[PDB]
Homo-oligomer: A and B are copies of this chain.
Amino acid sequence: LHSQANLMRLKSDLFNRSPMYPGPTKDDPLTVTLGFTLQDIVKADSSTNEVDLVYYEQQRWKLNSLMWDPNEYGNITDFRTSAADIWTPDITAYSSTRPVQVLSPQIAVVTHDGSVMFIPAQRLSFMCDPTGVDSEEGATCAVKFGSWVYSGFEIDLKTDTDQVDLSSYYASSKYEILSATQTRQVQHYSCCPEPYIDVNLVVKFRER
């Protein structure tokens, strides 16, 4: 009754009484940490050169305007909110061939220090030539993820590790993973001074 009431006031205080977050700027840049858990390569189509992945995409960011003291809110350390109610980063695959499909409830975890955890399970079709998938060496494909409309001066993309998490990879998949990495890259365009950041998902795989 008290625990339940304190949360209704907390969400209210952050979401109603406080004017919300309009996004990162040059003066107030934002670090977004990114990491992948690869669950299944579902299909590799050699007549269109599309491959279908199911993965979990972990997204982590921190905000002052989502900080609070648990002492003023009944020891409440964390809460759940719909991703629609808050700002989320516009991380996008740069070479998908169909719109991403979301497999999970679009819900994020907000902790008292202002950090936000958002992990949507997704199915992506993307550009990939599976030539060699039927051999010892397998095939190698790559896809880039990054912000659609922010430079590296507004959203800094970062990984916690270069190793894609394969500890939940489906053991009875048509395809087995020889290796899977996630590398931060800095890209410039000749028009412009800003750096642009993406994370390169490289997967090497073969028929099992």
Residues of chain A touching chain B, judged by Cβ–Cβ distance below 8 Å, are 1-5, 7-8, 11, 19-23, 25-28, 39-40, 42-43, 47-50, 54, 64-65, 74-77, 79-80, 90, 92-93, 95-105, 107-109, 119, 121, 123, 127-129, 148-150, 170, 172-174
Identity of the chain B residue whose Cβ is nearest the Cβ of A150 in the assembled complex: B80
User: With the chains together, A4 CA to B100 CA distance in Å?
Assistant: 30
CB pair B97 A92 closer than 8 Å: no
Task: Take A3-B28, A22-B4, A22-B8 as given contacts and tell me if A90 and B103 are in contact as well, using a CB distance cutoff of 8 Å.
Answer: no
User: With the chains together, A196 CA to B65 CA distance in Å?
Assistant: 30
User: With the chains together, A22 CA to B74 CA distance in Å?
Assistant: 14
Copies of this protein in the complex: 5
Q: Lowest 3 A-B CB distances belong to which pairs?
A: A129-B172, A3-B27, A90-B105
User: With the chains together, A77 CA to B153 CA distance in Å?
Assistant: 13
A-B contact pairs, 27 of them (CB 8 A): A1-B64, A2-B28, A3-B26, A3-B28, A4-B19, A4-B22, A8-B20, A11-B22, A22-B79, A40-B95, A40-B97, A40-B127, A42-B97, A43-B47, A43-B48, A48-B174, A54-B127, A90-B107, A93-B103, A96-B103, A97-B123, A99-B102, A99-B123, A104-B148, A105-B148, A127-B172, A128-B172
Task: Take A43-B48, A97-B42, A148-B104 as given contacts and tell me if A80 and B23 are in contact as well, using a CB distance cutoff of 8 Å.
Answer: yes
A4 contact from B25, B101, B109, B148, Cβ within 8 A: B25
The smallest beta-carbon distance between A175 and chain B, in angstroms, is: 9
